[PDB]
Design an enzyme around this catalytic site. Structure first.
Site, PDB file in Angstrom:
ATOM      1  N   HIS A 103       0.804  -1.206   0.000  1.00  0.00           N
ATOM      2  CA  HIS A 103       0.000   0.000   0.000  1.00  0.00           C
ATOM      3  C   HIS A 103       0.840   1.260   0.000  1.00  0.00           C
ATOM      4  CE1 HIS A 103       1.090  -0.744   4.180  1.00  0.00           C
ATOM      5  NE2 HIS A 103       0.890   0.541   4.411  1.00  0.00           N
TER       6      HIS A 103
ATOM      7  N   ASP B 135       0.478   4.988   1.541  1.00  0.00           N
ATOM      8  CA  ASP B 135      -0.328   5.604   2.589  1.00  0.00           C
ATOM      9  C   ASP B 135      -1.459   6.516   2.148  1.00  0.00           C
ATOM     10  OD1 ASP B 135       1.215   4.377   4.716  1.00  0.00           O
ATOM     11  OD2 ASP B 135       2.776   5.868   4.309  1.00  0.00           O
TER      12      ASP B 135
ATOM     13  N   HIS C  51       4.666   0.357   0.468  1.00  0.00           N
ATOM     14  CA  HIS C  51       5.447  -0.387   1.445  1.00  0.00           C
ATOM     15  C   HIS C  51       4.601  -1.518   2.003  1.00  0.00           C
ATOM     16  CE1 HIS C  51       3.597   2.919   3.772  1.00  0.00           C
ATOM     17  NE2 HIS C  51       3.572   2.084   4.796  1.00  0.00           N
TER      18      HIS C  51
ATOM     19  N   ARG D 106       5.427   7.361  14.505  1.00  0.00           N
ATOM     20  CA  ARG D 106       5.353   7.881  13.155  1.00  0.00           C
ATOM     21  C   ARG D 106       4.928   9.333  12.991  1.00  0.00           C
ATOM     22  NH1 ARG D 106       2.707   5.533   7.650  1.00  0.00           N
ATOM     23  NH2 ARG D 106       1.713   7.505   6.995  1.00  0.00           N
TER      24      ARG D 106
END
Ligand SMILES: [Cl-]
Ligand SMILES: [Cl-]
Lengths: 281, 280
Positions: free
Chosen positions: B97, B99, B253, B268
């Site tokens: 995917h 993000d 990723h 994150r």
């Protein structure tokens, strides 16, 4: 020579023709509209035509030169008429989507099929329109496929393992392969007469598209081999003794059901040579 | 000091050293880092035991940061999300995917810090949309360039997975209602470098609207496999205090979900992006 009764069997392909005696030479006015009905409907069907290999070869001869198949048996005295005699000792090998002999540089422009002996039921033959299939492609896909070339290989439908019963049959296969090396043909073919664009790959002989990568090719052929099976692009024919089927082999593929053995089925086919397949935008 | 950039492959990934992320980077150092991210798409820095405040400071230099409305945030730093996976919160990122492409302006990138890790497992992989694109044959590049694909929130959040409680299910409905499907170019032109990159991801891309439905299935089936080619990737085995910074505009990723029952904690920072576009 009056006027043949042409009844379309669908919007995009197929039509039944009545009013033409194929046992006797057709006038010029008749042969002309038979010719045009074939171009127009891609495949036409005529019932109650008890013709002999002789007259069948004759009728085909009028469309042009005839191709002699490298492996199929031919009728006695008439080398151009192949005999498709299927049964337990010779299982049908046409239950796959294919365009006739695309493994040569000038694939047949057409063919005439005669139903000699048929099983009680089954054995239907289907035709799919490469024209309708092409039309169903989005513009991006038409642009993508147009200009691409694909390899056609005689061995895809004529595997060596299928021809090792007798040494004779095997030798016939060796000579066929030597004379029919893999070759390229446009993926989208422009009909030499009508000018209509048509998809021109068939699972029977098309091994891969050479202008893209191996995985891209497998993806495209996977799509195309399924795409052409859409019901809307087809016409299905239930055979009756002495039926006649004539089709434009430049823009169609056909599939013959293998659902009748142990019953025997005998068909006679005249194959009309065409010219070099090309694509012209 | 000049940062040391070590490419991890010819198309993607690089490991960087000489940058103390616990303190402000010199402008020259940051320029080096920023350009390294642009060039290598994803960069990794080891032995960077930073605080969330320090992670945010670094991230803000890349642009506006996202304040997640749902995920817990680190200490007193709203811009740093705490990704805590374990048996009671199973990892669910083991799919290719990019993000949040289901929104109009998907994140430009992110900075991920490894806080606490399982003894082994949890590797994260990135695949280069640029390399994948360039690996396409000319006919395919021409085909895909200019096409648009629909990205749908529901692809990664299947309704059949949120219908357990007659009541707490309309929650799924509320989310889908705020995230209507939308379009993005299939081939995205990087806003800075001008590099063309494949920009579809199995995580959210449902279909290419400019081709038929079946053509779309074939193309995406091909593309979702194509981007998984080893040559287009870089695989990172985490160690505590690792820092990964990636350009979410041209990559996808995948985070391995192979460490339960162990726990994994990442911090994150998500850098807001602009509208993806294609320009020949
Ligand atoms: Cl047949
Ligand atoms: Cl991760």
């Amino acid at each position: 020579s009056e006027r043949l009764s042409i009844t379309p069997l669908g919007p995009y392909i197929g039509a039944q023709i009545s009013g033409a005696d194929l046992t006797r030479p057709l006038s010029d006015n008749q042969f002309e509209q038979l010719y045009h009905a074939v171009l127009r409907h891609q495949v036409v069907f005529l019932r109650d035509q008890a013709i002999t290999p002789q007259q069948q070869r004759a009728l085909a001869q009028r469309f042009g030169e005839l191709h002699i198949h490298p492996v199929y048996p031919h009728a006695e005295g008439v080398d151009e008429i192949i005999v498709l005699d299927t049964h337990n000792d010779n299982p049908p090998d046409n239950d796959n989507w294919h365009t006739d002999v695309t493994f040569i540089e000038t694939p047949p422009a057409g063919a005439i099929l005669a139903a000699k002996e048929l099983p009680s039921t089954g054995g239907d033959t289907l035709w799919t329109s490469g024209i309708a299939a092409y039309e169903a492609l989005s513009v991006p896909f038409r642009q993508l496929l147009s200009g691409l070339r694909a390899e056609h290989d005689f061995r895809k439908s004529f595997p060596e393992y299928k021809y090792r019963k007798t040494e004779e049959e095997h030798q016939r296969w060796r000579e066929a392969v030597a004379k029919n090396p893999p070759l390229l043909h446009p993926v989208v073919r422009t009909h030499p007469v009508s000018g209509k664009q048509a998809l021109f790959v068939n699972e029977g002989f098309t091994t891969r598209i050479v202008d893209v990568s191996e995985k891209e090719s497998e993806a495209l052929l996977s799509f195309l081999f399924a795409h052409i099976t859409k019901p809307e692009f087809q016409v299905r024919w239930r055979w009756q003794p002495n039926d006649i089927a004539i089709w434009d082999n430049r823009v169609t593929q056909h599939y013959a059901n293998a659902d009748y053995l142990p019953q025997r089925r005998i068909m006679h086919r005249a194959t009309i040579l065409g010219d070099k397949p090309f694509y012209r935008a």
